[PDB]
Amino acid sequence: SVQIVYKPVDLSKVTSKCGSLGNIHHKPGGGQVEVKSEKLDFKDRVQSKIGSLDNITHVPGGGNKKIETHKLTFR
Amino acid sequence: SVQIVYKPVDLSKVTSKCGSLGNIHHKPGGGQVEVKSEKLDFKDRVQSKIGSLDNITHVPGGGNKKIETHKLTFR
Amino acid sequence: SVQIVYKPVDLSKVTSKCGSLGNIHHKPGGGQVEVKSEKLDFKDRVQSKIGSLDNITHVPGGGNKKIETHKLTFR
Amino acid sequence: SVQIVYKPVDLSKVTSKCGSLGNIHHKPGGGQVEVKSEKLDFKDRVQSKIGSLDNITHVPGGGNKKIETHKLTFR
Amino acid sequence: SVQIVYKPVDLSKVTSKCGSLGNIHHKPGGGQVEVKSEKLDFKDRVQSKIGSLDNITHVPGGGNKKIETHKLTFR
């Protein structure tokens, strides 16, 4: 015979305090950008990205994160 | 016979205090960018990225992180 | 017969205090960037990145991190 | 008595030939430009120029130049 | 008595030939430019120039020059 008891406990806390947030600046790609092409052969798929792309500014007033996994597995 | 008891306990705290956040600057790619191409042959896939791409500014007023895994596994 | 008890405990604390955060500057790629290509053959996959790419500014008011693993495993 | 004769002569020529003119490029000021000021006192006249100013491109298909002066003076 | 005769002569030629002019590039100021000022006192005149200024590209298809002065001066 088998007896399995799984009764974990958690009273934990994750916390922050901040007095103020501000005066934050992000300026990607201020210079001039220039592209020239002549006499090219492509016999297969092409992708191109030119300029100011995919840039992020992220300013959360907290931004705390908790991750928890439980995983019983049996035969 | 088999008798298994799994009863872990957790009272943790994760904590921060900050008096103020600010005057933060990010400026990628201020210089000029220039590309010239002539007489090229491609017989297979091409990808190209030219300029100011994928840059991140990230300013959390806390940003604490707790990660936990439990993993019982039996036969 | 087999009789197993697993009962760990945790009363830990992870903590920080800061009087203020600021006057932080990041400026990648102020110089000029220039590329010329003539008479090339490619029989194979190509990727190209030219400019200011993938740069990060990261300024957490806390940024504490806790990682924990439990792993009982049986036969 | 006075007898003065001034009778200069000139049969001279200035000449050019060019087979073609072209593919000329001028790109002043491709980089980013940035100016910040705090707590300044001025008790007299000020001038300021900021940016891309007073630049010239000049492509004459000839541009030959002859200057001549005759300057008699007497008492 | 005074006799003066001034009768100079000139049959000169100035000449050029060029097979072609081209593929000429001028790129001043590709790098980033940055200026910060705090706590300054001025009690007299100020001039300031910041950036890309006064640049020249000059491509004459000849550009030949002749200068000539005649300057008799009597008493």
Place this chain on the structure above:
Amino acid sequence: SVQIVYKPVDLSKVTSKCGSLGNIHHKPGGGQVEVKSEKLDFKDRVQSKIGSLDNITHVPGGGNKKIETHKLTFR
């Protein structure tokens, strides 16, 4: 009495020939430029020049040059 005769002669030729002119590059100021000032006193005139200024590219297809002076003078 005085008898002055001034009769110089000139049959000069000044000449050039060129097969072609090209592929000429002038690229000043590729590096980043940066200026910071704090706590200065000026009781006198000020001038400032910061950046890429006064640059010249000059490509004549000839550029031949003749200068001449005649100066008779009396008492």
